[PDB]
Each structure stands twice: as structure tokens, then as C-alpha cells.
Amino acid sequence: NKDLWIKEEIIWSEHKCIRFAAGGYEALIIPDVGGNVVELKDTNKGVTILRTPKKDLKFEDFKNRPQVYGLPVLFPPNRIDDGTFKLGDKTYKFPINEAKNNNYIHGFIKNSKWTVHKKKIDQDKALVEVVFDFTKENEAYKYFSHEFQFKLSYELSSKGLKQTTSVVNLSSEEMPLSVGYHSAFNVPFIEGSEDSNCRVKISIDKFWKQDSRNLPTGESFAPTGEQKEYLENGVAVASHPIESLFSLKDIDVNGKTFRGACIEDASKNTRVVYEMSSEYKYLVIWNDMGDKKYACIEPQTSIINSPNVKLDRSVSGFKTLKPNESWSGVCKLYIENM
């Protein structure tokens, strides 16, 4: 059909981008900055899901802070205490990039150049894949001496956007692994609505307290107060500042298990759904004070600071990859009627 295509074009004067469309959806990915999908919309429904840079934002200001737009991939997601952890008798020590709390945070792959690996239209789906090759020549290799390849595989269709994230350890040693996304959502996501019309639901299990450096204390709690609304009628995310860490569980929705989040605008009878595979065990919600018409909903394979917590790996979610072993997780983003 006419709405199935993939276009490579120039953005910000000298950067390649890929725009892709299938099943009424259209997306835009920026390989040069984190392979970030900065736009996902359904123009006929008038819905734009992901927070996208405005025309006036300079490339350099995007590249320096891409995590507040689109789908920023994190490695590791969130904080490592003092930028250091051990694996067996090996010490990893990273330069501090969160000064106030003395942590290493989020990783560099979100800021880095990825290369286009595949572009394919097939049946009525559009597939775009980008990869990041981390080699011995990378300036960061001295701090994390494991060759690896990350891949983001995006499949767009009438079912929305499917994101398959994978990484393979190409090194000769066991590689620490924690992955997530700093995903940035429009609230509201449709014209003729308001931020106050949006409710956020999340399939939370427990709340995890954070200390004054934003590191987990290791204590977890049943949802209390407003947190309970994530499982019932939804939190009015724009009403006040929110910065919270939860573990995730499956819930039952319409005879089927579901893990993830959704953003409901009852006024427009539309729900944005962010479905996450079981590989995603924790989630940070952060709305940047709630006054900027967006919120971040941030899935993670493990707890914040997972390499350092005094919890078993089955709880923390910290993982390692053996040589040539891979990890993969899947998320889906789509729109549905309420």
C-alpha cells in the first residue's frame, strides 16, 4: 500500500536519518545519536507518542542530552555508585558523569554514532536495524575492556512499533550487563487535549526507596498512597514532580498477561501502550517536575546500581554475559481505543 515505505534523508543539514512507515504509523530514527527513534506517530489518529526535538533545537544540544527525547538506549540504565563496581576480583572504575551525587549514569551509547544495519519492507511491515560496534579502538575501551555489539531492531506494522534490543559479548571475558531505556513520552499525545487529561498506569510490584544520592537503600515496599493508582485508575502524571523506582510484575488485562505501562486520555478515548518483555524487571518514572508536557517511563533489566546492591541476582536482575553470549529484550508501542 501507499503507507508502507522507508526513506533515508538528511536532517540537521548533514546527518542521515531514516523515516519509516507501515500500517498507518510513521517513525523517525537518528543513527548518529544513539539510534534514537525520536518520533512515532499515527497521523490519521492525530497521535504522536514520543517526545520529538522541536525545529529550533540544534543538533549539538540534542547530541549532548538525547535522553529527554524518543527512545534513548541505556547501558547501564541509571546510576553506578562512585562510578565503580567489582565483578569477581575485577574492578571497573568509570569517570564520574553525575557530579552532584558522584555517580556514573546512563552510559555513552545513547550519545554515540550507530550505523544502519538493515532496511527492509516485507509483507506490510517496515524493518530498520541499527548497530553499535564497540571495539578495542574506542576511547572508552580502557574503562570497560569488552568488545561488544549492540543492535536495535525496529519493526513497524499495523500493530505499532516492535523494538528488539540485543547485545552480544564479543570479548574473551565475562561481561557485566544491565540495559534500559530513558523513553520520553508526550503528555498529552493528541491535539485538543491537556496534560491534566492523561493518566499513567504501570504494572508495578514493589516501590524501592532511594537515598539522597538517588541510590537504592535496598528496602522495598508495597505501593502506598498515590502509587496504588498505577494499578487502578492511573496517576495524573502532570500534577506534581515524580521520580520513582519500581519493580515490575505481570498483571491480567482482558484475559491476557501484560507487563508495562500505558497513558490513557479518556477525553479522547485513546490509550498509548508501552508493553515490555519479562527481561525488563524494574522501571523508573520521572516527569521532569511535571510541567514540560512529557514524562519518562524507563524500563530496566535490573535495579539502579545493581552491580553493588546486597541482594541476590534473582532479585537485583544484575546479569553477566559469557563470551559470545547474547541478551535480548522486546518492547512494543501502540495506540488503541478505550
Residue 276: C-alpha distances to residues 233, 284, 300, 331 (Å):
20, 13, 10, 4
Answer yes or no: are the C-beta atoms of 274 and 333 closer than 8 Å.
yes
Residue 235: C-alpha distances to residues 50, 197, 229, 250, 261 (Å):
19, 11, 6, 18, 11
Which phi and psi angles does 268 have, rounded to 5°? -110, 10
- Nearest residue to 183 (alpha-carbon basis) of 152, 155, 221, 210: 152
Task: Compute the distance between CA of residue 75 and CA of residue 147 in angstroms, rounded to an integer.
Answer: 14
Expt. technique: X-ray
What does this entry list as its resolution, in Å? 1.8
The dihedral sign for the CA sequence 54, 56, 59, 61: negative
- Nearest residue to 283 (alpha-carbon basis) of 313, 248, 308: 248
**Grid cell at residue 141:** 575501551
- Nearest residue to 53 (alpha-carbon basis) of 184, 249, 205, 157: 184
CA angle 207, 312, 330 (to 5 degrees): 65
Number of separate domains in the chain: 1
- Nearest residue to 77 (alpha-carbon basis) of 245, 260, 295, 208: 245
CATH code of the domain covering residue 277: 2.70.98.10
Answer yes or no: are the C-beta atoms of 70 and 50 closer than 8 Å.
yes
Host domain of residue 176:
1-337
Cell numbers 526513506: residue: 7
- Nearest residue to 113 (alpha-carbon basis) of 87, 139, 93, 90: 139
